[PDB]
Amino acid sequence: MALLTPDDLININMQLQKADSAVQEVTGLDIKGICKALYGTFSSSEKVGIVPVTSGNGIIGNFSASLHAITQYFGFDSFVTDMPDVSGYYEAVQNGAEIILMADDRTFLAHNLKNGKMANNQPCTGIIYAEIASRYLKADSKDVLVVGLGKVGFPGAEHLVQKDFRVYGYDADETLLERATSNLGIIPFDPANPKKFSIIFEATPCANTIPEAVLSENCVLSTPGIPCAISEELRDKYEVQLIAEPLGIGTASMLYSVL
Ligand X SMILES: NC(=O)C1=CN([C@@H]2O[C@H](COP(=O)(O)OP(=O)(O)OC[C@H]3O[C@@H](n4cnc5c(N)ncnc54)[C@H](O)[C@@H]3O)[C@@H](O)[C@H]2O)C=CC1
Ligand Y SMILES: C[C@H]1CC=N[C@@H]1C(=O)NCCCC[C@H](N)C(=O)O
Does 206 belong to an annotated binding site? yes
Does 219 belong to an annotated binding site? no
- Helical residues (DSSP H) of the chain, grouped into ranges: 12-27, 31-39, 63-73, 85-94, 121-134, 153-162, 174-184, 232-237, 248-257
Q: Which is nearer to ligand X, 84 or 248 (CB)?
A: 248
How many other C-beta atoms are found inside a 10 Å radius of the C-beta of residue 22?
A: 18
Considering only residues 12, 60, 145, 167, which one is a binding residue for ligand Y as defined by CB under 6 A? 60
Q: Does 246 bind Na ion (CB under 5 A)?
A: no
Are 168 and 149 a contacting pair, CB within 8 Å? no
Q: Does 101 bind ligand Y (CB under 6 A)?
A: no
Q: Does 63 bind ligand Y (CB under 6 A)?
A: yes
Are 12 and 62 a contacting pair, CB within 8 Å? yes
Alpha carbon 37 to its chain centroid, in Å, reads 16
Q: Which is nearer to ligand Y, 68 or 159 (CB)?
A: 68
**CB 206, min distance to Na ion, A:** 5
**CB 63, min distance to Na ion, A:** 20
Residue 143 binds which one of ligand X, Na ion, ligand Y, none, with CB within 5 to 8 A depending on kind?
Answer: none
- Each residue of 164-175: b (16+ CB within 10 Å) or e? ebebbbbbeeee
**CB 244, min distance to ligand X, A:** 7
* Residue ranges in contact with ligand X by CB under 6 A: 2, 121-122, 125, 147-153, 170-173, 176, 203-206, 209, 224-226, 245-247, 249-250
Sheet holding 47-51, edge to edge: 77-80, 47-51, 99-103, 108-112, 118-120
**CB 52, min distance to ligand Y, A:** 4
Does 152 belong to an annotated binding site? yes
